[PDB]
Design a protein around this ligand. Structure first.
Ligand SMILES: COc1ccc2[nH]cc(CCC(=O)O)c2c1
Length: 260
C-alpha cells in the first residue's frame, strides 16, 4: 500500500466512526471546556444533585452501577457497527469475528471513555450530564473503586491529544488483534492490522507532525488497557458474590464469560 491508499483507508474509517458513535471527542470537549451555548451539562456530585438530575437521564451506589452497565451495552452495540465497517473484517471466519469483538470491546470502551473525562469527572447521558470523580470515588466500598483507574488512564491518555480521526484508526487496530485467545485463523487478521498500523503511522505523522514517537507512545498505551480490564473483572467477581439480587446484562455476561 502507498500513501494514497493509506489516506483513503484513514478517511474511510473516520467516516464510519462518525456514523457509528453519536458522542465524539470533538463534541465532548466543546461541552467540557464551556466553549458552548451547547447547553452545558447538569453536574452531579452528591445524592441530591443526583436525585434531582434524574429529571433528564435500590441504593445510589447500585443505581449508578446499573447506569454505567446499560451505557456499556449501548457502547458494545456501537463498537459492533463500527467493526463491520473495517475493511476485511466481516470476511473473516465468524467465530473469529466474535473472538475479536469479545476481547476488543472493553479496551475500546475505556479508550473512548477517556474522550469524555477530565481530571475532575466524566460526561454522561449523551453529554447532558457530568458526574464528578469524587462523587464516584466516594461510593460505598466496592463501587467507589470502579471508575478511579479509568480516570488515571484517561489523564495520561488524554495527554496524547488524539482527535477523533486519530482514534478511528487506533480503535480499528485494537479490534484486529492477532493475539486474542482461541483465534482460529491468525494470519488474515494480522494482514489487516498491518495495513491499519501502516495507516495509523501515516495519520499520526501527518496530523501531529511535531509530536515525536507519538505512534510508539500510542501503542505502548495498549498495556495500560489490558490491566484496566483485569482489575474490572475482579471487581465484578466480587459483586456477583456479594449482591446476589443483581445481575449483568446478558450481552455483557457473554463478553466476560471465560474471558482470560
Ligand atoms: C460504578 O460502577 C461502574 C463504573 C464504571 C463502569 N464501567 C463499566 C462498568 C460496568 C459494566 C461493564 O463491566 O461493562 C462500570 C460500573
Amino acid at each position: 500500500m502507498e500513501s494514497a491508499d493509506l489516506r483513503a483507508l484513514a478517511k474511510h474509517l473516520y467516516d464510519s466512526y462518525i456514523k457509528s458513535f453519536p458522542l465524539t471527542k470533538a463534541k465532548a470537549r466543546a461541552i467540557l471546556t464551556g466553549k458552548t451555548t451547547d447547553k452545558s451539562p447538569f453536574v452531579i456530585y452528591d445524592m441530591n444533585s443526583l436525585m434531582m438530575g434524574e429529571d433528564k437521564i435500590k441504593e445510589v451506589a447500585i443505581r449508578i452501577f446499573q447506569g454505567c452497565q446499560f451505557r456499556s451495552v449501548e457502547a458494545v452495540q456501537e463498537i459492533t457497527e463500527y467493526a463491520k465497517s473495517i475493511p476485511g473484517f466481516v470476511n473473516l471466519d465468524l467465530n473469529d469475528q466474535v473472538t475479536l469483538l469479545k476481547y476488543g470491546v472493553h479496551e475500546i470502551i475505556y479508550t473512548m471513555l477517556a474522550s469524555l473525562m477530565n481530571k475532575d469527572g466524566v460526561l454522561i447521558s449523551e453529554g447532558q450530564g457530568f458526574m464528578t470523580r469524587e462523587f464516584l470515588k466516594s461510593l460505598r466500598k466496592p463501587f467507589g473503586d470502579f471508575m478511579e483507574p479509568k480516570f488515571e488512564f484517561a489523564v495520561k491518555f488524554n495527554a496524547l491529544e488524539l482527535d477523533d480521526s486519530d482514534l478511528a484508526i487506533f480503535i480499528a487496530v485494537i479490534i484486529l488483534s492477532g493475539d486474542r485467545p482461541g483465534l482460529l485463523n491468525v494470519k488474515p487478521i494480522e494482514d489487516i492490522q498491518d495495513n491499519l498500523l501502516q495507516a495509523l503511522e501515516l495519520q499520526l505523522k501527518l496530523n501531529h507532525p511535531e509530536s515525536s514517537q507519538l505512534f510508539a507512545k500510542l501503542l505502548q498505551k495498549m498495556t495500560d488497557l489490558r490491566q484496566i480490564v483485569t482489575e474490572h473483572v475482579q471487581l465484578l467477581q466480587v459483586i456477583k458474590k456479594t449482591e446476589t439480587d443483581m445481575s449483568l446484562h446478558p450481552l455483557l455476561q457473554e463478553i466476560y464469560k471465560d474471558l482470560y
